Amino acid sequence: FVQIKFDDLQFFENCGGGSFGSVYRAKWISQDKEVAVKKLLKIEKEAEILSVLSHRNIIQFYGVILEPPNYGIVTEYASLGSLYDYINSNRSEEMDMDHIMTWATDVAKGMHYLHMEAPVKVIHRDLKSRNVVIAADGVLKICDFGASRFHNHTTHMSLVGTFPWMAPEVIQSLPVSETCDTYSYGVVLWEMLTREVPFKGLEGLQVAWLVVEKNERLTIPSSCPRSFAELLHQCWEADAKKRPSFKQIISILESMSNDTSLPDKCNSFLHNKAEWRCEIEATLERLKKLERDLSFK
Numbered sequence: 425f426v427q428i429k430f431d432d433l434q435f436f437e438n439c440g441g442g443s444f445g446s447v448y449r450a451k452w453i454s455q456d457k458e459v460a461v462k463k464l465l466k467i468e469k470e471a472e473i474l475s476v477l478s479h480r481n482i483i484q485f486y487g488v489i490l491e492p493p494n495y496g497i498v499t500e501y502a503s504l505g506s507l508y509d510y511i512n513s514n515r516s517e518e519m520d521m522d523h524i525m526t527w528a529t530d531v532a533k534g535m536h537y538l539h540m541e542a543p544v545k546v547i548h549r550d551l552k553s554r555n556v557v558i559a560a561d562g563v564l565k566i567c568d569f570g571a572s573r574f575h576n577h578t579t580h581m582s583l584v585g586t587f588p589w590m591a592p593e594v595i596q597s598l599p600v601s602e603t604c605d606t607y608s609y610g611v612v613l614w615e616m617l618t619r620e621v622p623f624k625g626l627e628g629l630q631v632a633w634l635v636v637e638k639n640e641r642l643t644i645p646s647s648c649p650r651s652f653a654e655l656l657h658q659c660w661e662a663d664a665k666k667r668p669s670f671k672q673i674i675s676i677l678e679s680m681s682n683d684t685s686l687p688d689k690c691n692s693f694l695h696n697k698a699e700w701r702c703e704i705e706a707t708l709e710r711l712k713k714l715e716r717d718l719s720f721k
């Protein structure tokens with residue numbers, strides 16, 4: 425439980441962009457290291473117990489600020505920014521199959537560590553693309569895996585903007601197993617495949633209702649390779665007990681990379697978004713038309 429002095433940190437821009445949160449890029453002066461600093465109301469003993477987690481695909485704890493009124497958690501800083509910003513920028517057009525396979529595996533291995541390999545079982549419950557960051561060598565690291573433990577509850581305000589990634593049982597505040605994270609991982613994979621914002625522009629509670637009540641799921645383009653479509657469908661099962669573990673997802677991804685025909689099929693699909701983005705936009709339009717109907721009641 426390394427202690428860092430508030431004065432040993434030269435601050436920089438908040439990392440959140442839209443809905444900034446309380447995370448800043450900073451320089452740890454005495455260690456000559458670039459860091460992230462999450463400002464906190466107070467440090468609790470949960471920060472101490474999670475401070476020993478270490479895995480290449482989770483953000484690395486460095487220390488805590490323990491100087492009232494300045495509290496915070498310090499971690500490494502991933503040079504290449506958030507997964508969400510990458511996907512929703514022109515840079516992601518460079519992605520091919522190999523890139524996706526490696527990044528799908530990165531997140532799966534981080535979640536496997538959190539679920540099965542840490543001294544304490546961590547269920548994220550808020551896995552999403554904005555909670556994954558890209559280090560300088562391209563290794564993805566999961567962030568914010570302790571937040572669902574720090575706060576014991578939710579409100580509509582804190583859920584706004586996150587409904588597309590939430591498993592139905594999480595939306596419902598029903599019993600929760602670790603495979604709620606499998607559902608969210610499916611959305612992140614879909615984001616990488618389609619390079620779109622899931623359910624873009626839709627009322628969060630319409631998304632919740634569509635996913636929870638109607639078994640609605642994100643549109644998978646018809647030309648998406650069957651191996652990806654099938655894995656998405658497995659991740660998105662309404663019944664959490666039918667979703668695969670992350671150990672199973674890892675073995676599935678590994679087998680897909682022995683498939684000699686998949687790279688051409690996937691690369692052709694990935695680079696053909698001008699042709700199939702209309703399938704995703706058609707469903708958005710239909711759900712927007714559905715929203716107009718459900719406004720008149």
Ligand SMILES: COc1n[nH]c2ncc(-c3cn(-c4c(F)ccc(NS(=O)(=O)c5cccc(Br)c5)c4F)nn3)cc12
Pocket residue numbers: 439440447460461462470471472474475483484485497498499500501502503504505506557558566567568569570571
């Ligand atoms: C442009 O935005 C970025 N570009 N590059 C980046 N690199 C990194 C980050 C980043 C780091 N964090 C961060 C943090 F500072 C402190 C804690 C957590 N997660 S946690 O669950 O509370 C946790 C983690 C480890 C030990 C414990 Br104990 C607790 C945390 F995620 N948040 N964002 C953002 C960017």
